Amino acid sequence: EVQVVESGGGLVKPGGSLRLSCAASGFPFSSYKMDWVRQAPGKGLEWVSSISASGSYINYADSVKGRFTISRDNAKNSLYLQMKSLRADDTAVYFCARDGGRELSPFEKWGQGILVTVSS
Amino acid sequence: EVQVVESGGGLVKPGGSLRLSCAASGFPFSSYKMDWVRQAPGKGLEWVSSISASGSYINYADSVKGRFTISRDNAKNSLYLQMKSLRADDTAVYFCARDGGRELSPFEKWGQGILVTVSS
Amino acid sequence: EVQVVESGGGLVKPGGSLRLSCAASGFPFSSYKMDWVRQAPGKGLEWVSSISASGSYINYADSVKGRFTISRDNAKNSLYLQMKSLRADDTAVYFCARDGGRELSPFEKWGQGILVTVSS
Amino acid sequence: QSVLTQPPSVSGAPGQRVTISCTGTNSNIGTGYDVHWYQQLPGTAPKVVLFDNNNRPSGVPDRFSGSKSGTSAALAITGLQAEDEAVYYCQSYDKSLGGWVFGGGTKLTVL
Amino acid sequence: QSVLTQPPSVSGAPGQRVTISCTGTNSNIGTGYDVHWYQQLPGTAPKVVLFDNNNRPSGVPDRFSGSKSGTSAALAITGLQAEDEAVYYCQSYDKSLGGWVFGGGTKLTVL
Amino acid sequence: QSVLTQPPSVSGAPGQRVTISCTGTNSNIGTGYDVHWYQQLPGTAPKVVLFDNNNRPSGVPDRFSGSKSGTSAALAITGLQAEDEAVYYCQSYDKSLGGWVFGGGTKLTVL
Amino acid sequence: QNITEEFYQSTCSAVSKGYLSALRTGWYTSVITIELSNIKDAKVKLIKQELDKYKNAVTELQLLMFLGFLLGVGSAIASGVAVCKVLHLEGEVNKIKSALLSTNKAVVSLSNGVSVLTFKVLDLKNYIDKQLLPILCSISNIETVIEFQQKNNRLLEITREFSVNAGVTTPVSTYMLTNSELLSLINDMPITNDQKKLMSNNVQIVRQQSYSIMCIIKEEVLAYVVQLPLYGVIDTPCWKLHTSPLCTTNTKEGSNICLTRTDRGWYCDNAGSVSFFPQAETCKVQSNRVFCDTMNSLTLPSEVNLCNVDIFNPKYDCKIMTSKTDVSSSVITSLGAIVSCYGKTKCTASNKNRGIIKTFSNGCDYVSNKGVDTVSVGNTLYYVNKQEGKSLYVKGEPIINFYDPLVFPSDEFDASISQVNEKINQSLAFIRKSDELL
Amino acid sequence: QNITEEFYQSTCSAVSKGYLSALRTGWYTSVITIELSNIKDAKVKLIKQELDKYKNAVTELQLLMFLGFLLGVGSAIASGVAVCKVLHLEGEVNKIKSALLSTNKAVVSLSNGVSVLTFKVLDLKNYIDKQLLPILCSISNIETVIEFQQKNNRLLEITREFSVNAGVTTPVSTYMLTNSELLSLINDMPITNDQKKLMSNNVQIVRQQSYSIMCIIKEEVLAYVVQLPLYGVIDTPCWKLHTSPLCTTNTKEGSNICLTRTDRGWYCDNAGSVSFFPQAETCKVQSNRVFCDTMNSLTLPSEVNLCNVDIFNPKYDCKIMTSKTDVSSSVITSLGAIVSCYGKTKCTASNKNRGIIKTFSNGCDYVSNKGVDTVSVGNTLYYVNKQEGKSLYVKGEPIINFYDPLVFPSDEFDASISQVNEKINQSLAFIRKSDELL
Amino acid sequence: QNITEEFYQSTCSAVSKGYLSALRTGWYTSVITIELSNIKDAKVKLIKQELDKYKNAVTELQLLMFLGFLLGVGSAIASGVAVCKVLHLEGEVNKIKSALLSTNKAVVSLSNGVSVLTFKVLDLKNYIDKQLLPILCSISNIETVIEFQQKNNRLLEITREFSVNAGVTTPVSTYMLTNSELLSLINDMPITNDQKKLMSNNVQIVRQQSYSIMCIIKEEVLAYVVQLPLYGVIDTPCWKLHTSPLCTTNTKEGSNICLTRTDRGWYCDNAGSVSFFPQAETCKVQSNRVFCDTMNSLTLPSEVNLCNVDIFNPKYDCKIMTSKTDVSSSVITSLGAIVSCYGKTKCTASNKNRGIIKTFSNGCDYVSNKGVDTVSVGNTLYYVNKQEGKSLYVKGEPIINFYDPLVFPSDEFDASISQVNEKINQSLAFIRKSDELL
Ligand SMILES: *[C@@H]1O[C@H](CO)[C@@H](O)[C@H](O)[C@H]1NC(C)=O
Ligand SMILES: *[C@@H]1O[C@H](CO)[C@@H](O)[C@H](O)[C@H]1NC(C)=O
């Protein structure tokens, strides 16, 4: 059974920074590409960022490019987001998601999600 | 143990039609090219027509071309000639012949031959 | 177990001729290139000639070219030199030498050497 | 346009067949990318109910069919049940966005 | 010319060696085609006694030799016997005729 | 020049490391050929003590080292012994001479 | 004709029928001739550069001059090389030059009595002697430079091809023989009309099965030999056998036994016998026609086909291999796919418009290509052939279930039904004799 | 990434890690289109020659139209050939013509519902109809002759490649698709950005794994299909296994037993399993990236890696072969060399500046490439790879020493650890059972 | 030299002797340099098109930058790739540029201490910088357009070869190295004159055994490494072993046992041992000289030749394989043909002018090529080699007749005479021990 969990999200002020941590337990972490998906309260899903299985390929949405930096540690089976210069538009519930191990597969393993609030 | 036997030849008027049949019994019929050879009384052998093992390739002598129609049915192990609009020059003994199974081999199996008479 | 031994060298007047012979006993003669090396009294070694394992390739130093003719007979495991038009500079101890079986290997089997004297 | 267009709400009586549309553009579906479908309950994470426009994950009932044609995709739920009341998302890869575009979401109400 | 030329008849004493010639043209033998030889009795079908100008079928005695040279071919029968009295035909493929050309036929008489 | 240049003689006390130099030309070492080393006693045939500029034949003590750099080669003898005194020859192939040139010979004296 | 396929569940094998034979049984050697010359401002500089390229090409050419282990070993270019030695005899080259003096094509009789077609494809002697020697140094038009480049280019291309192939090239390229030249050669070859149509309609297959052998440069003529295939067995029925491993499906990892038919390959009827071609490179399929080289073939009795309808027949001993490695794989046949699914591997069949339409269980199964585009076995995706044809599924109990696993020989690479059965005899007897003794 | 190597002395095997996958899992088919024209003084003669070459190319193209035995059999160009059949339907060529009227690149949806990328790479209709028809017959400038030769060259080169390959070429050459055209095709493919960067940076590998299939000439349009690889599993850990025979070292000839691990090859992480590639041609290594074709692959559980740490582990049965032929050889690994020295063979390791550094004793040993350039085993010299990396020597007692030679089965080609032990079961039982009875 | 052949009736094998060795034992790496330029009316348009082609090639190249299972595994281009990494160090390219500033060929010592031959084969810097830069916007003569095309052609051809081969090509074509360049390269290598004569007279074999490795583009110079063979063991005796299956000739179909010698291949004397080359690709025979690569070879004692004269000798254990598949085949040797005819298969030998001159009986027989042109076995026809030489038939009773069929092991791929004998004495013991026990 896969246990994908998140931690490290709370209440930050605008222009502040946070670092999200996502830890996986029950699969070969090094053979899967990991993603971040956020859902603002009352709206739909938005893809944030992705990192390939060994970290060679990293992608960002234009809305977070230059402010968010995804990273992973295959030794610890961990995912990180490292948000910086956050704005009010950044308030959402953030999911770390794992795909099916191939390039265009859907997300099939999700975390419970952690809420990040940006307000003055 | 090969037995090729012809039938269907008799007396016809000039411009008439006949159908010759030759049935084989003791070899893999579909693996052999079949030929018709005719011998006018007192004369030599004249090659008439040929059909390949599966019927893809059909050849006629110019004397009978456009007027004779060779065919075969591999299920019945039978060969047919189907002469039409016969003239006096067509009177001969017709042999169905089987070659050696390769392209330029001699005729190794012959029928007994049947007479076709075309007279006014 | 290698025993390469030379014979056939003595004293000859200038302009005369000799034929050296070197016989091998304890190795596959036909798979080794053979050489002649001479050393004048009180001087260094000078390479004389070489012949490949099967006699296809023959090499001479310029000092002996046109007057010395190396040859071998693989059946008797023998090497011959056959010098002609001997001069005073030609007196030396002549060694038959065997290489290591590859092209640029050093000599590892030597004969005991035989003196050739050219004087008036 | 890195946009997928979905009806805001769909409703159907129990036992009937409902359809949810997903209209794409030349950057995502007009390019040739496939469509995946997700079902999300209000408090939980999305769960995939269809991928590759017609392929069913393990544990999903045969009531979900799905199909793609041209520049649009559809999700069909025959025999509507109370357990199907959720928000449904279609998503595709978008070449201009360089990532995944999600649909607006269709809240399915079981009358 | 799509013609093979044979002597009209050949006679030989028993025990002698007789030869039957078969001269071809540039369309059959001058092209590179081989010659087959048939032995025919008055009431029966032809039987091959030689093929590829020198090859003997099974059941044919070594008295039949045959040879091909240039644009002509020959069939030789050493030790003439009464059983050899038949009509002999030479056969070749002809490119202009697009089929098999037979010789005119040579009656071998055992004197 | 199809010449290998060697010091006329070299001397050393027992236990001292002596070095014998062998400087060649563009037809010897500037072309890329390796250097072999020979040890010869006054009445006997030469015996190879080094080949490929640093490789030791079987039965040769590790005192002989050898090395090649640029267009010259050197033979070194650590822990000099009375049995080591002889004339030493370096040899190389020449593209110009079409064969082997030997060094002039370096007599080694043990004091 | 019409391709059909039959899948046998008992032996996990499929046969596709309906094919027609084009078997290479012989060789024809032809001689191809290029005439050369004995020769030796910015426009003159270009001509001299092209002339040096021609001379260097002449100098360079002068300086030049399962059951596959059961097959025999042949020399493919022995017939062509033998002709090359004939052309080295005195007066042979002059005979070919004399025959080609007024014509570009002739039949020449060699010393040993062999007649060969000879073709002059390039005439560089006349162009250099007439259009290029008198002007030799003031050139007034650039046209002669370009026209010289076009004529000499084919010679340079031929030389380049021969230089990287040690004088023997296969397939025969259009630089050695153009399409018009090859069709001309086929029409003059001592072959039947049926052979002429088959070669003329499949010249690309003819090229892949022919050789170009550089022969000689002597007396201002360049000659090379093209060895052309002779297709002697034509239009006979052919069929292809596809086999896959057939294993038991016990849940324990290493408790299963396997067998595979090893006689996969092409089979064609040949004068009352069957030509078997175990290897896959040796046979080229152009539409419905199968071009198989008889050199890489075994001659078998017609009873070899009995193994397809009954693997246990007494007339013929069917070749099999046994093992304990039950791995999953797929074999793509002419009209479908054999899927061998074992262990925890996931095997499915799908089509593009409907998705997964079949999920395979453990064992080996078959699916037709009518409603299937792809087959997935584990991490591998296979595209199936979309050729039209009829497929038949023949239901039958897999023969691996007839074997007692305790006495099964599971390490045979080149066994047969009888050899496996005879080994089962001995082990069963050994326990039987001991039991009687006890 | 960063390459490391581990040599196991117990099983005479080495593993090199740190590689990254680019696994071809699917195919994408694109249609490449050339637009043709239908045509009914020294410079005019030059144009006439070039026009005949163009017409002959159109006519010529029209006239055209250890464990590797465990793998399955696939059809490599089935997906491309399937698209070719679709293009033969009525109106399909017209749809592609209308899509490419004002643009050189478009996405066209076929009748079967598949959308393909269409490219017009050469437009010979425009040049012949506009810049060559009004003038032609008096040519005033040599420029048009050369310009026509440049334009028509690509068509002639493409025809030459198709005619000598029977219409199917691999790798895809730059005449079929230029670097500019291939990069444009990759950028519009329905793949992710990761796949686009991987393909764009490795176009030479992409060419080597792609096919060009001549399709159709119809309505003045030449079309061929380029089948491009889809790399669906990327950037996942990969590792290579190198194995060498492990034998006993008794002085008597013929008295030694041997075993070799037969599972040598490339292994790549793939979802929760491992892709195994036994063969060496099937995988191309570009720096740290391993391009392996999943068609020539086996799907195995991740527990297959347990054989590298423990050959005797109970979870996985490790494949081995046994023999009595103790010959000497060497295997050159990524960061070193495995040396198997037996009998009277002399085995050494050297570097260019210092000479022999190591002399191998009888058995199986290993040297890193840090201080070694060459390895000599008997009469053969090996150069080692000079790639940077870290090597680890794992000391262990060779497992061939655990076997009793009297009951050792030494004629197994495709055995395993359990199977070899199973034969040791039985042989020891015969002596044990007989002793009790006696 | 001159070829003799000996056929052994006892073991159904033939040996052809009289061949001479050219064994590739090392590598020589040389650096090939092309100087480039940093370049930033209808005749001008033609020049622009060629300049774009030149710039596109630079950008494309910058973007680029029986017993065979017993063999070891080498890395063929390890030495050449190692030199390529050396050329990437700081100042290495500039050192080569300075060495080739005034000459087209020089010996350069690298930083690692190795001296390499360096050759500048093409200078596009001078032509572009001195003949096209001052002009570019008026061109008065078409000569410069054709002259530019000729100079740039070699660069485009080299780029094409490297881009479809992933930067490594073999054989080395004449675009990478002309005959004039290769001969000059051979003359300056640090090899003996015998090696120089062997390489100069067989340059086509040298090309087939050499590699071209694209290395670097840096500082307006293009460099690639040509890895040339070193033939260290030359002019030693070589012989070729031909083997065919040897079976019993019982009339019942499956009642026959077979054995085949598996040690077929090339053998050459090498110092005091023999180099064995089991494969057929590894050895190229150019007239009388055999070019064998030592990487694909085994080192064996000279006693291996005892198997040809006495298969049962105690000094060496001869390798055999056993089976029950008595199929008919032929092996074409150097001076004749081995014919193994079994069952109902018809086997004959013939010549062109006389027809069938020998009909083979069941068994293994031999025929010489003196009076024979073709051999027929079943449905396949073999042409024999027409090389001149003497053949010897050594009569002897086939060794398959010495074996009792009841205890014969007939399922061995990799057995030997001794191994088969151990299995024979063991089963004989089992039946004998039980016979006395009962
Ligand atoms: C690989 O290992 C080296 C150790 O030499 C380390 O410096 C480096 O960070 C590691 N990772 C990569 C991607 O090189
Ligand atoms: C067993 O085989 C060996 C050779 O492997 C043979 O020398 C010996 O005589 C055999 N044993 C008996 C009892 O014959």
Author numbering:
A (entry chain D), B (entry chain F), C (entry chain H): 1 to 52, 52A, 53 to 82, 82A, 82B, 82C, 83 to 100, 100A, ...
D (entry chain E), E (entry chain G), F (entry chain L): 1 to 9, 11 to 27, 27A, 27B, 27C, 28 to 95, 95A, 95B, ...
G (entry chain B), H (entry chain C), I (entry chain A): 26 to 65, 73 to 97, 137 to 207, 212 to 513
Give excerpts from the publication.
RSV, HMPV, HPIV3, and HPIV1 all produce class I fusion (F) proteins which are essential surface glycoproteins specialized to mediate fusion between viral and host cell membranes during viral entry. The F proteins transition between a metastable prefusion (preF) conformation and a stable postfusion (postF) conformation. We have isolated two anti-viral cross-neutralizing monoclonal antibodies: 3 × 1 which targets HPIV3 and HPIV1; and MxR which targets RSV and HMPV.
To better understand the basis for the cross-neutralization observed with MxR, we obtained a cryo-EM structure of three MxR Fabs bound to RSV preF to 2.24 Å resolution. MxR binds primarily to antigenic site III on RSV with an equatorial arrangement of Fabs around RSV preF. Antigenic site III is a quaternary epitope at the junction of domains I and III of one F protomer and domain II of the clockwise adjacent F protomer (referred to as II‘). The mode of binding is almost identical to the previously reported cross-neutralizing monoclonal antibody MPE834 and the infant monoclonal antibody ADI-1942539, which are derived from the same germline heavy (IGHV3-21*01) and light chain (IGLV1-40*01) alleles. Due to a relatively shorter CDRH3 than MPE8, MxR binds in this cleft without contacting DII‘, and therefore does not require an extended loop to facilitate binding. Only the CDRL2 of MxR contacts DII‘.
